């Protein structure tokens, strides 16, 4: 498009015109000249360690907000809009910071959710819980806040959308933040035999763990401890209270003898590792959780070849012949792997969502987006399942990915930084 | 990087340095702003129906693509180098074009494939075979060229690389062009009782053929007749020699029942509606073969809903639970019809590769880059399989793309434009 452009869906013709994405000033990491669509993490944004942003470049970003969230109650220009901008404006030279008022956290919550590019679930973006623990102060308060979510995005296995936002970050007072990367992981240790016990992808948290004195059961699926620092200082050992953490016995509804594989995965995802910005405030502890879509689990988290990497056993239990690439058998046991997945919590009653459905709702809220808001920010390498592809609606969907706030962003680890 | 970009691989923790990307002068369509990496084509250099370069922008073109070719023999600034640089810049002066030396023209077409972002099976770039056939003026002579290159790359099942070069395009004299998307592909029929017979995606183009006389057979793969154009003349409908078109039918290592699905393809993948560009001049007939990686067949061309759609008759003939899509009836019909066909294939001794076997070598032939031309652009978008992305490597691996010349591009169809 001249000013306009244009996204279109070879499976079905149809075309969509974005304008929303003449509202981002924020940096992909492409140029004219190179497309940096496939990089994990091009440091555009991803947030430094260096500080924490000055009175003069915060207001210019407090206002671009406030502005957006009263013209989306379509009261721009107010007198309240002018006298909230006054407000902060002060508050901001006085303080150095400011604090949002419910109203403006809970619509910034919803539209980091909104932006992410990354998400193939945001058709639910508007129903989300926000959980404001703002006045918290400690590590044990923390691990109530926490505690409260879990439970409450569980719901006995009707899983709810849910966030809790944590203080934001000050100059010096200091940090909140949740070391653990999902509030509910299995840990994963090394052993000199070569081979990984449990989930590779833990192991040096679980280090920081054993290192913080916990009694680490040695054992496959051990759920983590949750590490919190509050207000910059040292993060405590916390045991999330089993009673509260839902998980199901993975099981196939022909194999019997898949059920003897000893594969069991927990409900509730929950990422705690992220950073929320909402007016140039940065809120570094900001866990929050949804559902799983299938593949999640099925694919990524056990045919990982880095991850549990359970493809050879679940290929040699069928009985397929492993000899050629050929032949398919990885194929074939990840359908299994992950039609297993998807029976196992329908069965345990427990909230889950099938690649099919979610890309199906997907280009639905992408079509809402677009006629709603004149777009719909999103990444085609992520947004596309692991498995089965073309298969799914999202692979013949253009897809056109810029950045947008708030946002959600992603942030050093905690223990490469703090100190004592 | 600060100047140098890297990539990383996720599952292997590899990484390479790209310094390649500095000699890409052509954009990729993203901005700073915006990614535009999942849109099919981008109108950047999608050849425009606007003439042909001019005298002018002609030279520098042919200048840049000269200092590469002596470059790449290491005789740079040469003699050679300059008497050949005066020669063409005459040459263009005179003829307002300029003819490439057989060596040229060898190596123009390496690269434009060595060049290809899209295009994961790479590795083999170097072992193209050169067909020249500057000196066709005819549509017969073309029909002669595409048998024997029909012939030669078929070589009985083990599939040989190669590319049939026709004159460049001038500024009035006129184009060739081969107006069928592939050399060997099948017709597409509408039927008012709204099915579609054969291939959904030749129907526009079968019609031509019919109008241009072709006697349809009406049939399910019917191979369609090639329709070449010479020096700008009308297109001419020509029967690729039977004998000469290799199919497969296509049948299942297990179910026996699978033969009776009435499933058959050709063996020779033949792409021979892009545009060659070399020097600035514009090859707009330039067909070229490989071989096929099993996906391309059994899940985009059969299972692609604007395609050959065969899912469900699969699924029902297997008996399975297609009242809910969370039973992953799509995901097992299809590992099936892709294990059919490459099993079917290797029997009649027809080369293939499995997505297993071309992403692992593709992940090799990128090392081979980034050690010997610093670095290799990458389309992640087309790179992974439409089927199994995450088991697969290159999933796993950061991929640059940007744009070298000489290239493969896409150009407009020669009908929505030729005249009379
Ligand atoms: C309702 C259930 C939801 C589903 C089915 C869903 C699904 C997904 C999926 C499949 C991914 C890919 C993650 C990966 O491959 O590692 C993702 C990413 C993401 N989702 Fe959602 N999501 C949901 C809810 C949420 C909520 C409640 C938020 C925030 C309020 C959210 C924010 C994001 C973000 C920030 C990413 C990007 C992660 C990254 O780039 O590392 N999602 N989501
Ligand atoms: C040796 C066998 C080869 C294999 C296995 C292979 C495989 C592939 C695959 C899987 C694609 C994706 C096409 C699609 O999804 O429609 C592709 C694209 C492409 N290949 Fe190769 N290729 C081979 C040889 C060649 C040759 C000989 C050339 C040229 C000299 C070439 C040039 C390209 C180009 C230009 C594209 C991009 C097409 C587009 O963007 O529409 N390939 N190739
Ligand atoms: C290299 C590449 O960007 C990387 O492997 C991406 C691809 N797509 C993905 N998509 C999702 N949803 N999650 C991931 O972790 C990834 N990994
Ligand atoms: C919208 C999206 O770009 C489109 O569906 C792409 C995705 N990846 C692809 N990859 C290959 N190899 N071939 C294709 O035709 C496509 N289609
Ligand atoms: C945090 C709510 C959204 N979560 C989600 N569905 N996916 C991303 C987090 C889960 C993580 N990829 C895992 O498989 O363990
Ligand atoms: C032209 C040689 C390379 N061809 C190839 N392997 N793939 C692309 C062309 C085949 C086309 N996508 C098809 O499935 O019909
Ligand atoms: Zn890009």
């Known amino acids: 498009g001249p000013r306009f452009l244009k996204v279109k869906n070879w499976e079905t013709d149809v075309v969509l015109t974005d304008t929303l994405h003449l509202k981002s000033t924020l940096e992909t990491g492409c140029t004219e000249h190179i497309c940096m669509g496939s990089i994990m993490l091009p440091s555009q944004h991803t947030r430094k360690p260096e500080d ?11 206002k671009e907000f406030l502005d957006q969230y009263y013209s989306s109650i379509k009261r721009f220009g107010s007198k309240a809009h002018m006298d909230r901008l006054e407000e902060v404006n002060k508050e ?25 590019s990354r998400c193939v679930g945001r058709i639910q973006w508007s129903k989300l819980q ?9 590590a044990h308060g923390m691990f109530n806040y926490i505690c409260n979510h879990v439970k409450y995005a569980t719901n006995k296995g009707n899983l709810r959308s849910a966030i809790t936002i944590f203080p934001q970050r000050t100059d010096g007072k200091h940090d909140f933040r949740v070391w653990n990367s999902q509030l509910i992981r299995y840990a994963g240790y090394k052993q000199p035999d070569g081979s990984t016990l449990g989930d590779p992808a833990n192991v040096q948290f679980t280090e920081i763990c054993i290192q913080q004195g916990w009694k680490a059961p040695r054992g496959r699926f051990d759920v983590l401890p949750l590490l919190l620092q509050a207000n910059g200082n ?9 009673e509260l953490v839902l998980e199901v016995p993975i099981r196939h509804p022909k194999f019997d003898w898949f059920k003897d594989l000893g594969l069991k995965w927990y409900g509730l995802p929950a990422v705690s590792n992220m950073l929320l910005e909402i007016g140039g405030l940065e809120f570094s502890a900001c866990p929050f959780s949804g559902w799983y879509m299938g593949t999640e689990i099925g694919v990524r988290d056990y045919c990982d070849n880095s991850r549990y990497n359970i493809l050879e056993e ?15 058998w990885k194929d074939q046991a990840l359908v299994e792997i992950n039609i297993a997945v998807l029976y196992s919590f329908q069965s345990d009653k427990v909230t889950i969502v099938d690649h099919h459905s ?23 390498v992520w947004i596309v399942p692991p498995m089965s592809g073309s298969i799914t609606p999202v692979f013949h969907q253009e897809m056109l990915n810029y950045r947008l706030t708030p946002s959600f962003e992603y942030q050093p680890d905690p223990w490469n930084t703090h100190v004592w």
Chains 1, 2 share one sequence.
Not at 52 to 62: E, G, H, M, N, S
Not at 315 to 322: P, V
Request: net charge negative.
């Open 92 to 116: 901001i030279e006085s303080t150095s910071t400011y604090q949002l008022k419910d109203t403006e956290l809970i619509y910034g919550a919803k539209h980091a959710w909104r932006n992410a």
């Open 358 to 380: 979610a890309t199906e709702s997907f280009i639905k809220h992408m079509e809402n987006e677009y006629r709603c808001r004149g777009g719909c920010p999103a990444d085609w």
């Open 130 to 138: 926000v959980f404001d623990a703002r006045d918290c102060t400690t």
């Open 314 to 328: 679940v290929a040699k239990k069928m009985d397929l012949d492993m000899r050629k690439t050929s032949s398919l």
């Open 234 to 242: 040292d993060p405590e050992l916390f045991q999330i209270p089993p």
């Open 52 to 62: 924490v942003r000055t009175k003069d470049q915060l207001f210019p970003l407090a």
